[PDB]
Design a protein around this ligand. Structure first.
Ligand code: CL
Ligand code: CL
Ligand code: CL
Length: 129
């Protein structure tokens, strides 16, 4: 599913991501924009052989099981395929664990490089939330 901008903001809020660990909704929408362009089916293969999955490009080295990432963990206790669903529940629940791991949203390199320090409120501007 490719979400609309406000549609995704609303879904993220529904699932308790808004201001989670102090990160406003615009941060999360911005991260999703640059990780996946709001496409739940997004996948990308990393140099180390791990793969990133879903709207927030969650990585199989630590967070989910794909059966093809040697030496990896599955800390969200989910198949990586769950992160591709039109229902963002699994991605949100896993993201909550990731952002609580110590480095906040810096875990998403694209958030650090493209969202951090910017006017992230622009991502939810106009949205009925
Ligand atoms: Cl915001
Ligand atoms: Cl594996
Ligand atoms: Cl980047």
């Amino acid at each position: 599913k490719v979400f609309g901008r406000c549609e995704l903001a609303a879904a993220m809020k529904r699932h308790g991501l808004d201001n989670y660990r102090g990160y406003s909704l615009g941060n999360w929408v911005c991260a999703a924009k640059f990780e996946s362009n709001f496409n739940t089916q997004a996948t990308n293969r990393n140099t180390d052989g791990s793969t990133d999955y879903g709207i927030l490009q969650i990585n199989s080295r630590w967070w989910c099981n794909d059966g093809r990432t040697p030496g990896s963990r599955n800390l969200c206790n989910i198949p990586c395929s769950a992160l591709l669903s039109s229902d963002i529940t699994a991605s949100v629940n896993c993201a909550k664990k990731i952002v609580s791991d110590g480095n906040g949203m810096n875990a998403w390199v694209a958030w650090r490089n493209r969202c951090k320090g910017t006017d992230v409120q622009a991502w939810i501007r106009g949205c009925r939330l």
